[PDB]
Ligand SMILES: CCCCCC
Ligand SMILES: CCCCCC
C-alpha cells in the first residue's frame with residue numbers, strides 16, 4: 001500500500017468565522033504516520049487558508065481550474081493558481097460533470113494541462129444509480145479513466161491520483177459497502193496495470209469518496225486497493241481528524 | 249441629464265500578485281473629482297488581496313460570476329459566500345459564460361433575481377452574436393435577454409440593477425463598433441424599459457457599453473446619449489484605465 005491520502009472537499013461552503021476554528025483544529029492535530037493531507041477550499045477562501053494552515057502534513061488544492069488564462073470571465077486558470085503557489089487540484093468532480101457540462105474529453109484536457117504544469121491531480125470517476133442498475137459500472141468508469149490516460153505520458157502518472165465517487169453515494173448518506181468499493185478499485189488498478197505496468201499501478205493512489213464518515217472510514221481503508229478518501233460533508237467538521245487517523 | 253456613470257474593469261481570467269499590486273497602487277494614487285462609480289472585478293482568488301489594498305473611495309469590488317446557493321457545487325462560489333466576505337457587486341450573464349458555459353436566459357435571470365434579493369448591485373450583460381445580427385434579430389435577441397430578467401424582478405429591484413450591452417457580433421469577429429452602432433442599441437434598450445417598467449426607471453438606469461473600449465475611443469462613446477459608462481476588458485489591466493474613467497467626466 002502506497003502513502004495514503006486524506007482529502008477534504010469543502011465544495012461551495014464556508015465563511016471566515018466558520019473556517020478559522022476548523023483550520024485551528026487542523027493545526028493542532030499532530031498525525032505521526034505517513035499520510036498526505038489535502039484541503040480544497042473555494043477560490044475565495046484559498047488565500048486565508050494558505051495563510052493560516054500551518055500543518056506540514058497538509059497541502060491546499062483548488063476545486064477546479066481551466067487550462068489557460070484569458071477571456072474566460074468567472075473562471076480561474078492553472079497558471080493563475082500556480083503563480084499563487086498552489087500545486088494540487090481536483091478535476092472532473094461528478095458535480096462538474098453533471099451540472100457544468102464537463103465531458104470526459106474536457107476533463108482529460110484539464111488533467112493533461114495540470115500534469116504538465118507540475119500539479120498533483122485528483123481525477124474523479126464514477127457511475128450513476130441508473131448506470132449501475134443497468135450493469136454498466138465497469139464500462140463507465142473505465143471509459144472515464146481511458147479518456148484521461150490517452151493524453152498522459154508514463155511519467156505524468158506519478159502526479160496522478162484517482163478518486164472513485166459513486167454518484168449514488170454523494171450527499172445521500174448511502175456509502176458503498178467496503179466490498180463494493182474494493183471491487184471497483186480493484187477493477188481500476190488492474191486496467192492500469194495491464195496498460196502501464198506493475199510499477200505504476202502499484203504506486204497509484206485510488207481514493208474512495210461518497211458519504212465517508214469517521215464511523216466507516218476505518219472499515220473502508222481495510223480493503224487492499226483503497227488508498228484513502230475524498231471527503232465532502234464530514235470534512236467541514238472536526239470529524240475530519242478522525243478520518244485521517246483511519247489511514248494508519 | 250444622465251445618471252451617475254460607471255467605469256467597470258472586468259479583469260476576466262487574468263492576474264498575478266506582480267501584475268495586480270502596481271495596478272492597484274496606480275488606481276489608489278488616482279483622484280477623480282467628478283461623480284463616478286468605479287468597479288474592479290478580479291478573479292475570486294484575487295479578491296482578498298484586492299480588498300486589503302484597494303483604497304480609492306470611488307471604487308467597489310465585484311465578483312465575475314456566482315451561483316444562487318451554497319452546497320454541493322464543487323468549484324463554484326455562491327452569492328452568500330461572497331456577501332459574508334463583504335462583496336456586494338457582481339457581474340452576471342457575461343457573453344463568455346453564455347457561450348462557453350451554457351448559461352441560458354433562465355439561468356441568468358434566476359442568478360440576477362437572487363443576487364438582488366440578497367442586496368447586491370448587479371451588472372447584467374446582454375448582447376447578440378454576429379449570426380443573430382446578420383439575420384436582423386438584434387432587437388429580438390437583446391430584448392428577450394432583458395425581458396427574461398425583468399419578469400423575475402420587482403420594481404424596487406431595478407435601483408440596484410445595471411445593464412451592460414455586449415456587441416458580441418463585433419467582439420467575435422474582430423471588428424470595431426462605431427459609437428453610433430452602440431447608441432442604436434442602448435436607445436432601443438432604454439425605450440423598452442421606459443415603456444414597460446417605468447419612466448422613473450429608465451431615467452435612472454445605467455446602460456454600460458461592453459464592447460472594445462480604450463482611452464482613444466472612450467470619450468467619443470460616452471458622448472452618445474444613452475451610454476452611461478463602460479464594462480472594460482483588456483484596457484483595464486493597464487494604467488490607461490485611469491484615462492477611461494476620466495472620459496466619463
Ligand atoms: C472549462 C471546462 C468547462 C466546460 C464547459 C462546457
Ligand atoms: C478554455 C475554456 C473555455 C471553455 C470551453 C468549453
Ligand SMILES: CCCCCC
Pocket residue numbers: 381382384386387432433436
Ligand atoms: C442590423 C442592424 C442592427 C440594428 C439593431 C437595432
